[PDB]
Amino acid sequence: DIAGLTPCSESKAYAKLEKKELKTLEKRLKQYEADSAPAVALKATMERTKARFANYAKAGLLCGNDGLPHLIADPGLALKYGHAGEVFIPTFGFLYVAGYIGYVGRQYLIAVKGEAKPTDKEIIIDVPLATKLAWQGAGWPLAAVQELQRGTLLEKEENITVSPR
Amino acid sequence: AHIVKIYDTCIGCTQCVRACPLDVLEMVPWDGCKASQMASAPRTEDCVGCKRCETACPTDFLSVRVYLGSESTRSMGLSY
Amino acid sequence: LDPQIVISGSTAAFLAIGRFVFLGYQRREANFDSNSTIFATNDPAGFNIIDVAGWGALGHAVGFAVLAINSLQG
Amino acid sequence: PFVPPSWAPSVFVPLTGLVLPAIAMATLFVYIEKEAP
Amino acid sequence: MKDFTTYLSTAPVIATIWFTFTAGLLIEINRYFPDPLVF
Amino acid sequence: EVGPKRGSLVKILRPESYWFNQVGKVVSVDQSGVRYPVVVRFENQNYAGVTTNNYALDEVVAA
Amino acid sequence: KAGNWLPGSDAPAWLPDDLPGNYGFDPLSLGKEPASLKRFTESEVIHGRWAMLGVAGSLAVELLGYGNWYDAPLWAVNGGKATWFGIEVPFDLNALLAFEFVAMAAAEGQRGDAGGVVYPGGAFDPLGFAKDSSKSGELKLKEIKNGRLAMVAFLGFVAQHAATGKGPIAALGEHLANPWGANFATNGISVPFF
Amino acid sequence: ATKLFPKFSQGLAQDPTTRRIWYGLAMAHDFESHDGMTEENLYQKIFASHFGQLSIIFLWTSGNLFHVAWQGNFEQWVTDPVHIRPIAHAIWDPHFGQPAVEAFTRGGASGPVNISTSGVYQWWYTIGMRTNQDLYVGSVFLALVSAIFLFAGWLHLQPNFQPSLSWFKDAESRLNHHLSGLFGVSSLAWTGHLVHVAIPESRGQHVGWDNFLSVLPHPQGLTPFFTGNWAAYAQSPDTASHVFGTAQGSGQAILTFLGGFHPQTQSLWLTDMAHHHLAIAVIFIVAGHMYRTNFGIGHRMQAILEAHTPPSGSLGAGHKGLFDTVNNSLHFQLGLALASVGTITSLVAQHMYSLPPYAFQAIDFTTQAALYTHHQYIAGFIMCGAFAHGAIFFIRDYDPEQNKGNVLARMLDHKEALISHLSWVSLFLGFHTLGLYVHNDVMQAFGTPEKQILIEPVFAQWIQAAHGKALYGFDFLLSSKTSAAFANGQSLWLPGWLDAINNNQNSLFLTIGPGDFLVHHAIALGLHTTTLILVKGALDARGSKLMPDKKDFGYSFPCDGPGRGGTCDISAYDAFYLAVFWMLNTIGWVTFYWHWKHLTLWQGNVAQFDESSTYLMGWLRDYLWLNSSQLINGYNPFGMNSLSVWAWTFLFGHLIYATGFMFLISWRGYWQELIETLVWAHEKTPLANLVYWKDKPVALSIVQARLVGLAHFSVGYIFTYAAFLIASTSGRF
C-alpha cells in the first residue's frame, strides 16, 4: 500500500511477534499454580496483549517488515487512505489543549497584572480567579481569533524594551 | 594597565571609591550633580580589574567602567 | 547541417541585433552602471571592438549550441 | 629514481624526533627570553 | 483557616495537587482504555 | 516648574538604560542646571537590584 | 470607475478613477506604489493583447480542423512538416527559432526603447479609429475587458487540457452533450475528493 | 624588563608572566591587533600568509605522493584492487617489540607499515597513475611548485613587489578572473587531462609525457569539434563488460552522459566526468565576463546592489551601501567564504559516498567511513568559523551610520524575534525527538515493541519515488513510465541512473524508515540549536540589556565581573565556545547514523538498523557496544595484533577528553592560589632556589582556559571516534 507497507491485519511478522509475546508470557505462566495471584496477573497481562493486538489490527494500521505499526503523517495520505486517527486528529487535539492552557495562563497573567502586587498573585495562586478562567477557557480558539481581529492580542513596538543595537 | 573611566552620569554617591580595594578612585569637586562631587581615577596604574566599583555603582547604566588592558605586576596582583 | 552557414548566420544576426536593436539600451545601462583604456572607433553609433567581440562571442556560442543540438538528432 | 636508502628511516626518524625538536626548542626558548635594549 | 488556605494556594502546593490530579486522570484513562495508540 | 509633573508616568528613551521603552513614575525634578534632573522610579528592578535612576529632560517622554 | 468588483466595498485610494477597467480590485495592494502601478498597466494591456491573439488562434485552428493548440507544435518533435491553412510550409524548427527570435527581438526592442508606451497610434492606427482622445475612453475599456477575459480563457484552456486531454472545442462539445455529467467536478483531477 | 617576544605587541611584551607567551602565540595571526597596523600592510600580510598556506598544502600533497611511491604498494594494488589493502607508509619505531613488528607487517610488505584509509590510491588510480614513477614525478613537481609558492610569498613582501591597497579592492577584476581563469580554465584543463590521459589509461593504453603528443584521444581527431558534430564524440562508449585498466570491452567515446555507475568498479564513468568538467568549464568561463573592469562592457556590483530595493519598503533601504560594508570588511568576506566552503564540504561528503567517483572505492568500506566523517567534521568546524567571523564583523567592522535602513541594519532591528523563533524550533525538536526516543525505549523495555511510535518518513520517501525509486510505489515523475519527465531522459541518462538508484546494493538513495526519520529530526535539532547559539552570539555581540556596551570590549574578553547578578560567558567568543560543543554533538549524530546504516548495509542485514534505530538502547548496545569488541581487544594479556594502535588511540582520546573536562569545570582562582603556594615552596627550598624563573608563573586566563578545554575536548572527541570507526570497519571487513 503506502510506501510499500502492508496492513497489520495481513502481516506475517505481526502475527509472529504476537505469538512470540504470548509464548514468553505462557512460558513464564507455566511455573506457577492455577489459583494463585501471579497466575491471575499473568493471565490478565495475556488478555491485555490479545486485546491490544486485536485492536491494532482492527484499527487498520500499516505495519512494516518488522511487524510493528507505522504512522502516516501526511494529511493527504491520512485522509485518503483512512489513517487520520494516527497523526491529524491527535494533532488537533493537542492544539486545542495547548491553546487552552496557554489562554488560561495568559488570561490569569493579564488579570493579575493590573492589581497592586502581581508578584504575590504569581507565587500564591488565586484559586477562585484561576478556577473561573480555567472553566471559561473552553472557548479559547474563538476568543483568540476575536482578539487577533481586534488587534488587542499583540503589544505595540514602542511599549517593548529592546537592546541598544 | 587597565583603563578606568568615569562618565557624566556619576551622581557622586561615593560608593565606588569605598568599594575599591586598591585605592584607585577618589572624589573631586564638580557642578553636575546635587552632591557636587564626581569620581576620579588618578591611580589606574594600581588597578587590578576586580570590577567591585562597577558592582557598587547604582546608575543605569554604570558611570564607572573598567576595560582590561596590558597586564603587569601590579595589575595581576602578584605578591612575587 | 552546414556549420559555416549556421555560424555565419548566428554571428551576423546577433551583431545586427546588437548594432541596430540593443545598442541604445546597452549604452543607457552602461552609463547608469557607474586607470582605463578608451577604444575610439569611427562607427557612427559607437559600436567599438569590445561590443563586436562580445556580440560575436554570444553569436558563436548560440550557433555552436544549435549545431550541437541538431547533431544529436533529437 | 628518487628512492631513499634502506637506512634512511633509522636516521631520519631519530633526527626529526630528537635532533630537530631539541635544537628548535632551545632556539625558540632563547628567543622568547631575549630582553629588549 | 484563611492562612491555611493561603498556604495551600502557594505555587508548590498548587503544583503538587494539579500534577497529582493530571497524573491520576491520565493513569485512570490508560487503565480503563489500555494501550491507546490511535484514535 | 520645568520638566514632568511629580507623580506622573513617563517613558524612558535612553537606549542604554535597562528601562528603555518602559513606563516609570516621576519622583522629583531638580531645579538646578544638572544634566539629569528627572528622577524616575520603576516597579521592576534592574540586574543590579536598583529601581530608581536619573534621566535628562529630553530622555523622558510623557506616556 | 467602470464598476465595483465587490458591491458595497470602498475602492482603493491608489487606483485612479480614469484608469481603463478600474473596478477597484486589488486585495493584495500590489498597485499601491505609483511606479509599480505604471508598469502594471502596460503589462496588463500587453498580456491582454497577446492572450486575445492566442485565444483567437487556438479557437480558429480547432474550428477549422487542424488539431488543437497543444497538438500544433507536435510536427517538429517526430518527423513532420508544418501545415498552415492546409498549405505546406518549407521551414524546419531551427529556421523558425532564428527568424522569430530576430523579428521579436527587433519589435520588442523598439517598443522597450520607446519608454513604456501603451497606446502608440499613428502607423499602428491606419484606420484612424482613435484619432480623438475624448472617444478613446469607451474603446479602451473594451480592449482591457476583452484582454482580461481572453487571459482567463487561455488559462482555462491550459487547465482543462492538463486535466482532461482534449482541446477547447472538444471540451465544449462534450459539456454540451452532458453538462451535469461532464464538467470539472467529474474529471477526477480538479477536485480529488469529489 | 620588556622582552623581544612578541614583536607585534609592546603591551604583551611588557608582561612579566607566563601569560605573555600564551597570548603572543594566540594573537600572532590577529593582524588587525598588532602595533602600527594599517590597511595596506594588513592586506600584504594576509597575501603572504595565503602563499605560505598554499606552499604547505602542496608540500603535504607531495609528501603523500612520495611516501606512497616509496613505501606503498601502488604497483601491486592496481593489479588487484579488491583483495589487496593499501599501504600508507612504513613504520620505524624502536619501541616496537617482536610481536608488534610481525603484527604490523601486513599488506605484502617487508616490514611494519600503516594501512591507509585516506583513499588516495583509488583517486590516483582513477585519474591515471599506474606506476610508482608517476607518483615520484608528481611528488617532485608538487614540491617544486610549493617552493615556488614560498618564494612568491617572500617576494611579495619586499619593496617594488608589494601590491597597492587599491589593487586588493578590485572586486570586479578579481571575481572575473576567478570565475573565468581559476574556475573555468582549471576545469577545462582537467577535462583535457581526463580525455588525454585518464580515459586512455583506463582502457589499457599508457599515455604519458613521452607519447601524448603522438597519440590521438579520438579516432576522428578534433574534426567533429570544429564542424559542430559533437554528437560523434559520444559514439561507441564503454560497454557493460568493460574491465578497468584493460582494453577488454573498452569503447572509443570521450564525452558521454550515460549516468549511473560502472558495473565493475561501482564508480562514475570517466567519460561522464570529463563531459561534466567541460560543461562546467564553459559555464564558468562565460560567467567570467559579467563585471566591468577595464573595457567599458560589464557590470558594477555596487550598481546591482543599490538597484535591488523593493518599492513596498519591505526590506527598508534594500541592499544600499552593501558594497562598501563588504569590500571594506575582511571579516564579512571571510565569513561568507567560510559559510560557502562549509556547505560545499558537506555537499562533497554526501555526493562522494552516494555517488562514488573513484574506481574500487565503494568496496573499501573503511575509506568511505573515514572520508565521510573527516569531511563532515571539517565542514562543522568551518561553519562555526563562518558564524564566529560574522560576530567579529559586527563588533569590529559594522558601521550603523553607513548601513542605515538596509537589510544588515534590519537584522539587528529584529534580532530578538530571530533568537526567539530559533529557540522555539530547537525546543520543539528537542522535546519531540527525546520524547519519541524515550517512549520507544520504554516500549522495548516493557516487551511491547508494537506500542512504540514509528512515523513513516513519507516526505523523503516521496522525493525518492520522484527520483525513480519504485520500492515505495508512488509511481510518478521518474517512477511512472508514461510521464514526460521519464520519457525525456530514456535516450540520454535515465537508463543507467534508474538502474543504479533501484539497486539496493549501493549507497545511492538508501531505503529509509522510522529510524531514519527520527535520526533526521535529531540532526535538525542539532543544526537549529547550533545555529541558535551562533546567531544569538553574533547579534548580541554589539550589546544587549545585560551589557549595553559590549561592542566597546572587543570580540573576546573574560566577563563583565560578578556584578549585575553575574556576567559569565557574556562575550561573542563565549557563544562560539558553547556552540563548538553543539557542532561536535551534531556531527557526532550524523556520523553515528552514517556509520551504523552503512555497517548494517555492508553486513547484509539492514533490518537490524531498521529495528534498533528507533530506541536509544539499540544505538548504545547494537552499535556502540557491538562494534567495539574487536577494538578494545587490540592488546590484552594473551598478546596483540595490528588493531592495538587503534585501542591505544581510543584510550588516548578518552584521556584527552577527560583532561579537557578539568579546564572546563575547575576555574582560575583555585589554580592561582595553588600556584602561589608552589611559588613560596620553590623560593624557600635550598639547592633549588638558585634556579629562578624568567617569567612569573601565573594561572591560565579565563579565555585561555576555555580555549584549552575546548581544544582537548575536540581532539579527544575526534581521535576517539576516528579510532573506533577505523578499527570497527577494518576488523569487520
XYZ file of C-alpha atoms in Angstrom, chain H residues 171-181 284 287-293:
19
model
C 36.469 43.127 -6.671
C 35.286 43.173 -10.302
C 38.640 42.147 -11.787
C 39.360 39.539 -9.107
C 35.939 37.942 -9.403
C 36.065 37.921 -13.222
C 39.498 36.295 -13.182
C 38.485 33.718 -10.572
C 35.303 32.768 -12.404
C 36.931 32.629 -15.838
C 40.513 31.613 -15.038
C 32.344 29.264 -15.600
C 30.232 33.666 -16.272
C 33.701 35.215 -16.053
C 32.622 38.124 -18.313
C 29.967 39.638 -16.055
C 31.750 42.558 -14.374
C 33.175 45.741 -15.885
C 36.914 46.039 -15.260
